[PDB]
Design a protein around this ligand. Structure first.
Ligand SMILES: Cc1ccc2c(c1)sc(-c1ccc(N(C)C)cc1)[n+]2C
Ligand SMILES: Cc1ccc2c(c1)sc(-c1ccc(N(C)C)cc1)[n+]2C
Ligand SMILES: Cc1ccc2c(c1)sc(-c1ccc(N(C)C)cc1)[n+]2C
Ligand SMILES: Cc1ccc2c(c1)sc(-c1ccc(N(C)C)cc1)[n+]2C
Ligand SMILES: Cc1ccc2c(c1)sc(-c1ccc(N(C)C)cc1)[n+]2C
Ligand SMILES: Cc1ccc2c(c1)sc(-c1ccc(N(C)C)cc1)[n+]2C
Ligand SMILES: Cc1ccc2c(c1)sc(-c1ccc(N(C)C)cc1)[n+]2C
Ligand SMILES: Cc1ccc2c(c1)sc(-c1ccc(N(C)C)cc1)[n+]2C
Ligand SMILES: Cc1ccc2c(c1)sc(-c1ccc(N(C)C)cc1)[n+]2C
Ligand SMILES: Cc1ccc2c(c1)sc(-c1ccc(N(C)C)cc1)[n+]2C
Ligand SMILES: Cc1ccc2c(c1)sc(-c1ccc(N(C)C)cc1)[n+]2C
Ligand SMILES: Cc1ccc2c(c1)sc(-c1ccc(N(C)C)cc1)[n+]2C
Lengths: 55, 55, 55, 55, 55, 55, 55, 55, 55, 55
């Protein structure tokens, strides 16, 4: 076989899960957050996949 | 076989999971956060995958 | 076979898990955080994969 | 076979797990944090994979 | 076979686990932290893979 | 002060939370269940407070 | 002071939390369950407070 | 002071938490379960407080 | 002071935590279980407080 | 002072923690279990407080 990509690719066979991202956010997984009190200014309480590039 | 990529690629066969990211965040995995009190200014309480590049 | 990459690639066969990242965050694994009280200003309480490049 | 990379590559066969990172954070492994009280200003309580390059 | 890399590569065959990092953090291993009280300003309580290059 | 109870009592002052139960079930706390597939005959998947006295 | 109980009592002062149970179940605490697949016949997957007295 | 109990009592002053149980189950504490696959017939996967008296 | 109990009592002053149990299960503490695969028939995977009196 | 008990009592003053049990299970302490694969029929993987009296 032959393949040429510029990116971003994701090429496969017999594949149970696939995610391609440029951005941005993708949530595909099981996630449970239980929480009782959030205070403070300002605290990232429960972050799973996170990116902060403030300018 | 033959392959030429510029990146970012992810090329495979018979593959159960795949993630390609440029960014950005991707959450595909099981995650449980149980939490009772968050205070303080400002404290990253529970971070799993995290990136902070403030300017 | 033949392959030429610029990066970042991830090339394989018969492969159960794959992650490619430029960024950024990717969470694909099982993670359990149980927590009772977070205080202080400001304390990284429970960080699993973490990157802080403040300028 | 033949291969030329610029990096960062990860090239393989018959491979159970793969991670490629430039960044950034990737969490793919089992992780359990149980915690009862976090105080102080500011103390990295429980860090698994961590990078701090404040300027 | 023939291979020329610029780095950082990781080239292999028949390989159970692979990690390539430039950064940054990668957590792929089993990790259990149980903890009861963290105080002080500021004490790295339980660090597994850690890098601090504050300027 | 003086108090005589037969039970079940719960007597207090300055008290943030109170539960009295004879039965029966009482749910007053924060609870998050995230779930993707339940099979089998018959499996208690995620039980928090549970009592089974089949005769 | 004077007190006579038959049980079950719970007598106090200045008390943040109180639970009295005869039964039965009481859930007052923070709880997070994240789960991806449950199979088998029949397996108690994730039990927190549990009592099984089948006859 | 004077006190006579038959049981089960729980008598106190200045007390942050109290639980009285006859039964039965009481869950008042922080609890996080993250889980990816449960199989087998039949396996107690993750049990925190547990009692099995089958007859 | 004077006290006569039949049991089970728990009598105190200035006391941060109290548990009285006859049964039965009580979970009041911080608990984190992270888990990736449970198999076998039948294996107690992760048990914290456990009692099995099958007849 | 004077005290007469039948048992099981737990009598005290100025006491930070108290547990009384007849049973049964009580979990009040910090506990972290991280786990990747459990197999076999049937193996107690990670047991903290455990009692097995099968008949
Ligand atoms: C500000 C900012 C942030 C990210 C960023 C850029 C600018 S430009 C860029 C990029 C995306 C894709 C590619 N190829 C497919 C070769 C090369 C570079 N990124 C990832
Ligand atoms: C501000 C901003 C943020 C992201 C960003 C850009 C600008 S421009 C860009 C990009 C998208 C796709 C591609 N290819 C398909 C080669 C190359 C670069 N990104 C991902
Ligand atoms: C500000 C910023 C941050 C990140 C960043 C850039 C600029 S530009 C860049 C990059 C992305 C992809 C590639 N190749 C596919 C060769 C080469 C470089 N990154 C990762
Ligand atoms: C949104 C937001 C706001 C503030 C903020 C963050 C996110 S994250 C962070 C911080 C992280 C680590 C540290 N040390 C390891 C000393 C100190 C401060 N702050 C201060
Ligand atoms: C779209 C597409 C399809 C296939 C494909 C690509 C892109 S890129 C690639 C490849 C790249 C490098 C290598 N080696 C360095 C051995 C081997 C294969 N394939 C096989
Ligand atoms: C500010 C900043 C931070 C990171 C950074 C850059 C700039 S530029 C860069 C880079 C990305 C990909 C490649 N190749 C694929 C050869 C070479 C360099 N990184 C990783
Ligand atoms: C089948 C069954 C189950 C529970 C059960 C009974 C019968 S009878 C009983 C009981 C309740 C309250 C009291 N007092 C206030 C002294 C004494 C006993 N329980 C708790
Ligand atoms: C089948 C069954 C199960 C539990 C059970 C009984 C019967 S009877 C009983 C009981 C309840 C309260 C008291 N006092 C207040 C002295 C004494 C005994 N329990 C706890
Ligand atoms: C079948 C079964 C199981 C438990 C059980 C009984 C019967 S009867 C009993 C009991 C409860 C409370 C008291 N006092 C307050 C003196 C004495 C005994 N338990 C704990
Ligand atoms: C609801 C339910 C059904 C079956 C069941 C349980 C719960 S719990 C259990 C069991 C527990 C331990 C053991 N060994 C330590 C050998 C063997 C079997 N089974 C078989
Ligand atoms: C309803 C009620 C109110 C008060 C009360 C009881 C019941 S029971 C009790 C007590 C029992 C035993 C003891 N000692 C063995 C020293 C001391 C005090 N008080 C003080
Ligand atoms: C089958 C079974 C199992 C446990 C069990 C009994 C029967 S009877 C009993 C008991 C409970 C409380 C007391 N006192 C307060 C003196 C004395 C005995 N237990 C603990």
């Amino acid at each position: 076989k032959k393949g040429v990509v510029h990116g971003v690719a994701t090429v496969a066979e017999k594949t149970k899960e696939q995610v391609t991202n440029v951005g941005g956010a993708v949530v595909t997984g099981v996630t449970a957050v239980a929480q009782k009190t959030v205070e403070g200014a300002g605290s990232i309480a429960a972050a799973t996949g996170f990116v902060k590039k403030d300018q």
